Design a binder for these strands. Structure first.
Lengths: 81, 78, 54, 144, 77, 78, 65, 49, 101
RNA sequence: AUCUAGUCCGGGGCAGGCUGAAGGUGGGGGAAACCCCACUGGAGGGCCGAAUAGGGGUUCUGACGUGCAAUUCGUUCCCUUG
RNA sequence: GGUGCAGAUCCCGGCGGUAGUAACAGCGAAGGGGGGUGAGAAUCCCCCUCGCCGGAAGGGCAAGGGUUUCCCGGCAACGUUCGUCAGCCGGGAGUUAGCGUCCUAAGGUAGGGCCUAAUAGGUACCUACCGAAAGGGAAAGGGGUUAACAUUCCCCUGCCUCCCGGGUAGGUGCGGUAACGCAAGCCAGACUCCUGACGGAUUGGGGUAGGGAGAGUAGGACCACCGUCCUACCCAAGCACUCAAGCCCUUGGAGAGCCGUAACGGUGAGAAGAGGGCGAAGGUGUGAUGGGCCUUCCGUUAGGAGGGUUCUCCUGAUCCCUAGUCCCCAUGAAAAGGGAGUCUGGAACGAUCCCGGGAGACCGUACCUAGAACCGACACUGGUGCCCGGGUGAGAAGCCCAAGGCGUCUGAGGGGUAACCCAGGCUAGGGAACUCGGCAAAUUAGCCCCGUAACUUCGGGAGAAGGGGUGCCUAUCGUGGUUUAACAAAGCCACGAUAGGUCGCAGUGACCAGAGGGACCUGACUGUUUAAUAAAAACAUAGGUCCCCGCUAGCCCGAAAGGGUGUG
C-alpha cells in the first residue's frame, strides 16, 4: 500500500521531464502490480514501473504515466506543487 | 607414535578413492539365462585398467562391458 | 609466509557467517553447520554444562 | 573555493583526460556558477571552457629515416642487428614462400601447355628435393 | 565479469563510419546437435545460436533426413 | 585379453610413473620407511641406516608391526 | 642410432637401446588383417589400431597388431 | 556489488546507521557534548556482519 | 548524415528479357570487391529481384559467369561490361551523386 | 584445512628466441649390402632469456634490525610446455 | 573484624628523567613563478611552465569493506607538518533490466532402514533435496540525457518466450536422377537419435583490433632560415546477400605413372578434369537526409547561420574460425535445456508463415581495487588477483615519448656541505702479496662468418676453445611478399647481400648484454623439502630383487553396520 510521495530534487525533474512518479510503498516483498494501486487512488493509467531497494530500508518504484495523464497535475492535487 | 602410511589408507579418505566417473563402467558379465548372440559396436580405453574394453549391443537390447579379447573387431558377432 | 603474508590471503568469505538463529556470524557454510546456534544437526538448542566458568 | 565540478565535468563532455583541460585565467568568475552539464556544454561554446586539442608524436624524422632505411640500404647491414640469424627472418616462412611460388608457376605452365605431363613431374619432384633455389634459377632451367 | 570464456573477443572498426571503438562479447559456436551411434559427421541441417522457426529448412526432405546418412541406418525400416 | 608385451617398453621416466597411477589409488611416489623418523615407522630412526630387527616375524604378529619379509618361504637371489 | 637419441644423452644408452628396439616395431609398417597392408595402421593406445582404409577398430597388443 | 541480499537485504541494525546524534535532541538534553558511543567507522573497524 | 554516394544501375541482358537492379555503395572501395567476382553478388541480386516481387527462373541457371570487362571512367563515370558464355550479358553504369541538404 | 599439507572437481596462465630426434624428399658413390650430402620435417620431464609475465628465495651473513613489516628491502640466482 | 605495607621483576591510576633527543632519509618523482580565497598559506585554489610514470602510478573488471559515491557547510581532534582541504566532521540525496534465480561434479544433507543403551554417533542400501555471481544455461544494441547510477530511464532499429485476433502452406503441396532446396498441418503420446560435452604439441589458410603511407579538406603550432608536424576525416546489433577449407553428389576414366601438400600423403575401394550441394569468420547494403567529428561566423541575455567530414595504398595482432598432422601404460564431466527422426491414438481445422494485438515475476545493480578504499592492530615498500600505442629495438628486455595519471608513495627551509654511514663513479704503479676462502668487485658479453680438443652412454660435450668483420653516408643489386595481379612491369613493403666515399680513441658507441680453462671427489640428471638460522650427498625417480595373495583372497580401518585396494 502506498506510503509517501518522495520529493527529492532528482524527482521533481522526472515528473516534468518524463511524467513519472517516485513513489515508495511497503516492502511487501511480493508484487505483480504496484500498478493497479494508483488508479483506484488517482484514476490514472500506468505505462511502466520498476524496482528499487534503497539502503535506508525502503522500496522505491519509478512509475511513469501515459501522455494522457500529466503527472504534475495529480502532484499539484496532492499539494507539493 | 603417529600411525603408519599403510595405516593412513585405512581411513578411506579422498586420497584413496578412484575417479571412476572418468572410467567407462563396471565391466562384469551381464546376467543371461540362455543362449544369445551379440555384436561389437565400440572399443574404448579405460584409465585404471591397463587393458582395453568393449561395448557390445545385445540382440535383446542391452548395454554392457567386458575386457577386450585379442583379435576381435567392431561389427563382428559374438 | 609464516609472518604477515600468512594473513594476506584472508580476504575471502568468512568460514562462518550469519546463522539465522542466534545472531552470531558463526555459520560454517563449509561444514553445513553452525557451531554457535546449533542449527544443522541438533533439533534442540546447543547448550552445554560449561557455557562459562562455573 | 574548490570547484573541481567544472574541471571534472569538462573531461566527460569532451572525452579527454582531466589534466588536458584548462580554464580561462580570466573568466573564473563566470565559470564558478556552473552547476549542470547543460551549463558546461553552454560554456564550452562560449570559449570560457577552453578544450586542449590532443597532441601527438611528431614523426617527420622517422618518415625521412624509414625512407632512408628502405631505399638505399641504410643501417640494414648485418653489423647492426640485435637478434640472431633467423630472428629477423623466419627461414621456414621463406621456404614456404619459395616452395609456393615455383609450384604455381609450373601449374600455369601446364594449364597453358608450356610443358607436358612427364616434364612436369620431374620438375615437381626436384622442387621437393631442394634441387632449385630461385624462380629465376628454376625458370632458367626450362631452356636447358 | 572476470576474464572468462563466454564470449569471443570482438571489436568494431571496419564497417564503421562514426568514430568510436569498443568491445563486445558473444557466446561460442554450436555444432550439429548431440548423441553418438554411427559417429558419422552429418550434414544438411541448420544449427545457429538462434532458431528462425524454419521448419524443414533445418532438416532434409529425405526419409531420415535430419537423422543421419545411409551409412549406418538400414537397421530400422 | 589384449595387452601383450605390456611392460617391455621401459618407463624411462618418473613422469610416466606419475601418470601411470594418476587415477589409481596407489599412493605415489612410494616412500620407504627406513629413512623416516621413528615416530611413524617401526624401522625408523637411527643415524646408521640399518635393519633394526630380523624382518621375519611370527604369524600371530599384531597389525601395524608386520613389515618387510612377511611369511617368506625363502630368500636370496637364487 | 636415430630415434634412440631423441632425448639427448640421458637415462642411459642401455635403457635407450631397450626402448629403441621395441619402438620401431610400432612404427615398422604392418599388414592390416581386415582391408590389407595397403594403408598403414596406427596405435592410438595399447590394443587400439585401425588403418585409414578399413575403418575397422579391433583389439591389438600393447604395441603390436 | 553481488551481495546476495542477506546483508543488504537486511537494513538497519545490520547495514545501516552509524548515525550522528539528532540535533534538536541535543538542545533538549542541554548536555555538554552529545554523542552516540556506538560510533564506528569503515576504515578502523570490522562490522561483525 | 552521410555525404556522397555511388549509385550503380546494371542492366541485365539475357534472352529477350531485360533486367535492371538498383543498389549503391558507401566508400568507393565497395565497388571493386563488389565486382571482384560479382557472380555471387549478381546472382544474389537477381535472387533478391525474384524475392522482392515475383517470378522464378529468370536467369538463375547461368553457369560460371566470366568476370567482366575493365572498369572505365571518363566524366568520372565508372563504366564497364560483363558478358557470360553466350546469350547472357550485363551492363554497368555508375553515378556519383552528392546527397547535400 | 580463508594459511599451510594433500587430493579431487571445475577454471585461468607461461612475451621471444634457440637447438633440431624420428620420418619424408632429392641428389651423389658403387648391381648389391647400403653410405655421404642437401633440404623438408617439427618429437623432447632439452637450452637462453621479460624487476611486478609468473615461481622459488641463492650470495651479498648487503640496509633496516626500539622496521616500510612480530620476517622485509635492494642487490645478487636458478625454473619457465612441464 | 575483609583490619595497620616499601617492596611481592605486585595490580591499577597519575607523572617523572633520558628531552624537543630519535625519527618525520634510504625502495631512483620535483617543482618554480605569478594571481585568488580566507584570520592564518611551502602544503588549499586559478594560470603557465617543468619533471616523473607510462605491459604500469593507465584502463576495466571480483570476494570485502557498507556509504568508502555525490552535493552543501565546516575544522577541536582525526591527517606522521600545516591546513580554508580530504576517504574527517556536520546538513541533505543516490543504484530500476521480458535481453542470481535453473541444472549438475567433486561431494553433502534429510528421511526410511543396519548398528549405537542413548544420542546433536556411524551409516555400505533406498528415496528426496542442497551444492558454481569464471561449469552449462532464450533472447539488444546503438547512439542520447543528470553532480551522483545505467546495455534498465528518452528515440530507432530490434530480438526472444508465452498468450490472443486474420488470412496462408498444410490434413488434399512441391523441382530436379540425386546430393538437397522450401511458408512444413494440429495435439496427445511413446521410443530413439542427433551439438550441447570437454587434453596437449605443432603448422597453414582465411579473417579482425590496433596501426601506418599520400593527396585533399579546416585548425594549431610553427620561424635565426626552412617548411614541417599534430589535429578530425567515421556508424553496432538485428535484418538481405555473400564465401574457404572440409565433407558429400553426379559425370568421368588413369601406372611404369599420375594428383597434391608447409609437411604427412591421395590414387582402380575411382586419381585427374568437368559440372554441383551442404555450407565459418568475416565483409558488403540497410539502420543512418538521425546523431557523432572537427570547424567558421554572427550572436554574445537568449541563442542563431554555414562548411566540410574524401580518395588511393601498406603492414598487421598474444584478438577470432578453419583446417589439417603428431603425442598418450595421462585419452581428457556429467545434467538439465534444445532440435530432429520413427510408430500409435485423436478431432478437422490449421500452423515451427507472416500480419495485427497483449504480457513477461522476485532479487543482484553506488563506489574501490589497492604505494590511502581488502587483509596484515595504521593513510603499512607484505600479500590477494585477473585481463589489455610509436619509435628504438627479436622482443611484454632496457630508454624515451604517445593515451591517461601524478608533483600525497605526504612534513619542510638554510648552508663553501666537517667527520662519518649507506648508496655510487674513478684511481697512477705492482697485480691475490689481503684473504680460512678471489668474498667482493672487476673482465667478457648482442650478432654474422670462419673455426672447435680429450672423453663418452655416439645422443653430446659444444656460445668447448680460438680468430675475423660490425659505424655514417652516396649509391646500387638480389630475394620474397602484397595490390582483381602465372610470370613480368607500376606503386608499396619486408628481408639479404655488393661497391664506393667518408669520421672518430672508441663503431652490439648508450642501453641490453657468459669470464674462461684444467685436475679431483660426491650425487645419475629435471624435480622436492627444514615458512621465521640450514636446498644438500636428505627424499622420489627410472631398474633390478624378494615377500603375501586366487576374491567369501590378500591388505589394511571402526563399537557395529561394514569401509575402502573394488566400476579391479
Amino acid at each position: 500500500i502506498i506510503k509517501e510521495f518522495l520529493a527529492t530534487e532528482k524527482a521533481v525533474k522526472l515528473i516534468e521531464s518524463q511524467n513519472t512518479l517516485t513513489i515508495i510503498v511497503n516492502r511487501n516483498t511480493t508484487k505483480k502490480d504496484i500498478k493497479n494501486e494508483v488508479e483506484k487512488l488517482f484514476s490514472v493509467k500506468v505505462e511502466k514501473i520498476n524496482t528499487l531497494i534503497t539502503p535506508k530500508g525502503e522500496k522505491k518504484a519509478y512509475v511513469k504515466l501515459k501522455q494522457e495523464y500529466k503527472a504534475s497535475d495529480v502532484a499539484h492535487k496532492l499539494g507539493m506543487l | 607414535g603417529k600411525k603408519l602410511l599403510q595405516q593412513r589408507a585405512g581411513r578411506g579418505g579422498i586420497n584413496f578413492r578412484s575417479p571412476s566417473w572418468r572410467r567407462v563402467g563396471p565391466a562384469r558379465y551381464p546376467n543371461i539365462e540362455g543362449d544369445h548372440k551379440g555384436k561389437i559396436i565400440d572399443i574404448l580405453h579405460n584409465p585404471g585398467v591397463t587393458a582395453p574394453v568393449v561395448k557390445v549391443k545385445l540382440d535383446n537390447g542391452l548395454q554392457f562391458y567386458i575386457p577386450a579379447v585379442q583379435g576381435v573387431a567392431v561389427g563382428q558377432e559374438i | 609466509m609464516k609472518g604477515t603474508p600468512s594473513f594476506g590471503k584472508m580476504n575471502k568469505t568468512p568460514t562462518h557467517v550469519r546463522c539465522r538463529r542466534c545472531g552470531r556470524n558463526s555459520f560454517n557454510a563449509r561444514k553445513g553447520y553452525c557451531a554457535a546456534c546449533g542449527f544443522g544437526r541438533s533439533k534442540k538448542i546447543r547448550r552445554y554444562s560449561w557455557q562459562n566458568k562455573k | 573555493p574548490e570547484f573541481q565540478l567544472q574541471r571534472r565535468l569538462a573531461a566527460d563532455i569532451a572525452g579527454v583526460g582531466l589534466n588536458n583541460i584548462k580554464f580561462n585565467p580570466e573568466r573564473l568568475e563566470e565559470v564558478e556558477e556552473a552547476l549542470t552539464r547543460e551549463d558546461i556544454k553552454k560554456l564550452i561554446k562560449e570559449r570560457a571552457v577552453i578544450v586542449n586539442p590532443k597532441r601527438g608524436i611528431s614523426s617527420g624524422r622517422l618518415k625521412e629515416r624509414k625512407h632512408k632505411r628502405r631505399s638505399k640500404g641504410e643501417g640494414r647491414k648485418h653489423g647492426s642487428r640485435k637478434g640472431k640469424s633467423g630472428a629477423r627472418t623466419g627461414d621456414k616462412e621463406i621456404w614456404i614462400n619459395k616452395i609456393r611460388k615455383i609450384r604455381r608457376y609450373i601449374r600455369w605452365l601446364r594449364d597453358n601447355n608450356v610443358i607436358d605431363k612427364h616434364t612436369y613431374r620431374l620438375l615437381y619432384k626436384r622442387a621437393k628435393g631442394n634441387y632449385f633455389k630461385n624462380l629465376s634459377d628454376v625458370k632458367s632451367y626450362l631452356r636447358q | 565479469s572476470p576474464q572468462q570464456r563466454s564470449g569471443s573477443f570482438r571489436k568494431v572498426f571496419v564497417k564503421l563510419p562514426s568514430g568510436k571503438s569498443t568491445i563486445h562479447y558473444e557466446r561460442r559456436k554450436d555444432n550439429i546437435a548431440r548423441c553418438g551411434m554411427c559417429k558419422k559427421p552429418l550434414n544438411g541441417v541448420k544449427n545457429n545460436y538462434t532458431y528462425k522457426y524454419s521448419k524443414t529448412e533445418k532438416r532434409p526432405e529425405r526419409v531420415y533426413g535430419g537423422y543421419l546418412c545411409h551409412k549406418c541406418l538400414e537397421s530400422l525400416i | 585379453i589384449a595387452g601383450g608385451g605390456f611392460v617391455e617398453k621401459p618407463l624411462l621416466k618418473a613422469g610416466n610413473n606419475y601418470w601411470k597411477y594418476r587415477v589409481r589409488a596407489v599412493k605415489w611416489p612410494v616412500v620407504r620407511g627406513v629413512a623416516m623418523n621413528a615416530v611413524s615407522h617401526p624401522h625408523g630412526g637411527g643415524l646408521h641406516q640399518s635393519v633394526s630387527r630380523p624382518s621375519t616375524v611370527s604369524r600371530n604378529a599384531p597389525p601395524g608391526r608386520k613389515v618387510g619379509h612377511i611369511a617368506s618361504r625363502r630368500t636370496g637371489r637364487r | 642410432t636415430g630415434i634412440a637419441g631423441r632425448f639427448g644423452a640421458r637415462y642411459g644408452s642401455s635403457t635407450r637401446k631397450k626402448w629403441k628396439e621395441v619402438m620401431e616395431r610400432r612404427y615398422m609398417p604392418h599388414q592390416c588383417p581386415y582391408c590389407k597392408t595397403t594403408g598403414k595402421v596406427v596405435r592410438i593406445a595399447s590394443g587400439i589400431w585401425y588403418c585409414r582404409k578399413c575403418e575397422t577398430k579391433w583389439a591389438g597388443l600393447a604395441y603390436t597388431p | 556489488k553481488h551481495k546476495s541480499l542477506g546483508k543488504k537485504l537486511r537494513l538497519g541494525k545490520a547495514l545501516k546507521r552509524n548515525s550522528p546524534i539528532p540535533a534538536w535532541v541535543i538542545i533538549k538534553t542541554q548536555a555538554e557534548i552529545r554523542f552516540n558511543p556506538l560510533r564506528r567507522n569503515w576504515r578502523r573497524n570490522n562490522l561483525k556482519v | 548524415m552521410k555525404v556522397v554516394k555511388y549509385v550503380l544501375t546494371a542492366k541485365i541482358d539475357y534472352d529477350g528479357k531485360e533486367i535492371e537492379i538498383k543498389r549503391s555503395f558507401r566508400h568507393r572501395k565497395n565497388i571493386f570487391e563488389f565486382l571482384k567476382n560479382a557472380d555471387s553478388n549478381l546472382k544474389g541480386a537477381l535472387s533478391e529481384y525474384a524475392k522482392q516481387n515475383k517470378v522464378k527462373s529468370s536467369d538463375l541457371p547461368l553457369n560460371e559467369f566470366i568476370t567482366c570487362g575493365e572498369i572505365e571512367e571518363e566524366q568520372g563515370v565508372m563504366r564497364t561490361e560483363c558478358k557470360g558464355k553466350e546469350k547472357v550479358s550485363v551492363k554497368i553504369e555508375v553515378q556519383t551523386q552528392k546527397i547535400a541538404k
